[PDB]
Amino acid sequence: TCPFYKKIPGTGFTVDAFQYGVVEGCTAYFLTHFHSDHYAGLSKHFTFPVYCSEITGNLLKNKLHVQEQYIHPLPLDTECIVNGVKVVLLDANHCPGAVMILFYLPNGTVILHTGDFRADPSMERSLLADQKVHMLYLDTTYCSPEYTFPSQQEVIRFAINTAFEAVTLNPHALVVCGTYSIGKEKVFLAIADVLGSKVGMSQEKYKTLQCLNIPEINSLITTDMCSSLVHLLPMMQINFKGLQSHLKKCGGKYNQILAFRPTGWTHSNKFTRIADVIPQTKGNISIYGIPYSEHSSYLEMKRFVQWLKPQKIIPTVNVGTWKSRSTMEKYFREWKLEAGY
Ligand code: NI
C-alpha cells in the first residue's frame, strides 16, 4: 500500500506514487523526475492527471507513450493553482527535468518535497527564501557523515584532462562512458567537447536525449558510431569482457579503450582525493570509477536544512530499517540543537 511519506496532508495529492494502483482519494499525481524507481507504474493506459516539469512531460509522451491529455507540465519558479491549491516547482539540481515542489496548504501550512536533489547554496536565493516552510519531505540518500565527495566541477575537470591526455598520446584510443538513466550528461558531453567529437549512442538513448531541451544537442550527439570517438554504452557493459567485445566491433579503428563509470559514492572517497584516483587496467583497457553525484553530500544536506529551519522532517530514502531511521533522526536533532531552531 502507498507509504505515508508519499502523501501530502490536507490535499488529495501524492508524489512519485505510480506503482500502487489507484491510490484512494488521490486527485493529482505529481512526478518529480524521470527515474524508474519514481515513475514505476506509468504507461499509455494511465488516465489520471500527472503534474511535472516540461522536460519530464516530454519523456512521459515520447518514452512511455502517456497520452497528452493527462500530462500537465508546469513552468518553473511560477505560482500555479492545482485543484485549488497553490504550488511552485523549483530546480532540484538532480537530473534534467528534476524538481522540488512547494505546496501552500489552505490552512497556512507550507510543505517542501525535495524529490531527489543535490542541495546547493543557490537554492538559498530562490522563492524558498520568501516564506517559512513547516514540513520538509527530504532526500536522505547520503544522510551519514562518511559520505563526502568533490564538486561536480572538480570531477569534470579530472575527466576532461584524463581523456584529453590519453587521446593526444594515442590518437587510436576510444573513450567509452557508461549510463543507465538520464542524468550525468556533463560527463560524456564535456569529454566529447575537449576531443572535437560527437558522442555516439544507440537510437533509444539518442531519442531520450532529444527530449531534454539541452542547447545545441544536435551539435554534440549522434547515432553514427563510426564518426565518433566517444561512445555511450549501458552501464552493465562497462567491464573488461563487455569492453573487449565492443573493441572487436570497431573493426581495427581503435587499439585501446579508456572507460568512465560515474558512480554515486564508493568508499575510496573516505581516503582518496580526486587527484589520487587511478583506474583498473587489463591489457589495453582501463576503467575509471569517478564520484560524480547528483545527490547531496552529508555536509550539503546539513547546510540546507540548518538554513531552512523546518519544524518537522520526513525522510524519503533509507526508511526501510529501524537502525537507518533512528540514526537519521539523531542527525536531525543534532542539526537543530547546533543551529538553534
Ligand atoms: Ni533520482
Question: Domains of the chain: which residue ranges?
Answer: 1-147+296-341, 148-295
Length of the chain: 341
Q: 105 C-alpha vs ligand 1 centroid, how far in Å?
A: 26
Residue corresponding to grid cell 516540461: 54
Q: 114 C-alpha vs ligand 1 centroid, how far in Å?
A: 11
How far is the C-alpha of 83 from the C-alpha of 134, rounded, in Å? 21
If one counts every other C-beta atom within 10 angstroms of the C-beta of residue 305, the result is 22
Please write down the HEC assignment for all residues of the chain: CCCHHHEECCCCEEECCCCCCCCCCCCEEECCCCCHHHHCCCCCCCCCCEEECHHHHHHHHHHCCCCHHHEEECCCCCCEEECCEEEEEEECCCCCCCEEEEEECCCCCEEEECCCCCCCHHHHHCHHHHCCCCEEEECCCCCCCCCCCCCHHHHHHHHHHHHHHHHHHCCCEEEEEEECCCCCHHHHHHHHHHHCCCEECCHHHHHHHHCCCCCCHHHCEECCHHHCCEEEEEHHHCCHHHHHHHHHHCCCCCCEEEEEEECCCCHHHCCCCHHHCCCEEECCEEEEEECCCCCCCHHHHHHHHHHHCCCEEEECCCCCCHHHHHHHHHHHHHHHHHHCC
Task: Let me know: does 6 contact 25? Beta carbons within 8 Å.
Answer: no
Q: 34 C-alpha vs ligand 1 centroid, how far in Å?
A: 7
Q: 168 C-alpha vs ligand 1 centroid, how far in Å?
A: 35
How far is the C-alpha of 272 from the C-alpha of 210, rounded, in Å? 36
How far is the C-alpha of 27 from the C-alpha of 263, rounded, in Å? 37
Count how many Cα atoms sit within 13 Å of the Cα of residue 225 in the half-sphere of its side chain: 17
143 grid coordinates: 544522510
Backbone angles phi, psi at 258, to 5 degrees: -110, 120
Q: 217 C-alpha vs ligand 1 centroid, how far in Å?
A: 22
Q: Choose among 258, 324, 325, 265: nearest CA to 300.
A: 265
Q: Choose among 19, 69, 14, 17: nearest CA to 44.
A: 69
What is the arrangement of strands in the sheet containing 312-315, beginning at the earlier edge strand?
80-82, 85-91, 99-104, 110-113, 135-138, 312-315
Pick the CATH number of 1-147+296-341 from 3.60.15.10, 1.20.1260.10, 3.40.50.10490, 3.40.50.300: 3.60.15.10
86 grid coordinates: 497553490
Q: 241 C-alpha vs ligand 1 centroid, how far in Å?
A: 28
Q: 94 C-alpha vs ligand 1 centroid, how far in Å?
A: 7
Q: 88 C-alpha vs ligand 1 centroid, how far in Å?
A: 20
Q: Classify 148-295 by CATH class.
A: alpha beta
How far is the C-alpha of 254 from the C-alpha of 174, rounded, in Å? 6
Kindly tell me the burial class for residue 318, based on how many C-beta atoms sit within 10 Å of its own C-beta (0-12, 13-18, 19 or more). middle
Method: X-ray
254 grid coordinates: 581503435
Q: 294 C-alpha vs ligand 1 centroid, how far in Å?
A: 8
Q: 97 C-alpha vs ligand 1 centroid, how far in Å?
A: 11
Q: Choose among 110, 95, 126, 30: nearest CA to 294.
A: 95
Q: 35 C-alpha vs ligand 1 centroid, how far in Å?
A: 5
Q: 255 C-alpha vs ligand 1 centroid, how far in Å?
A: 36
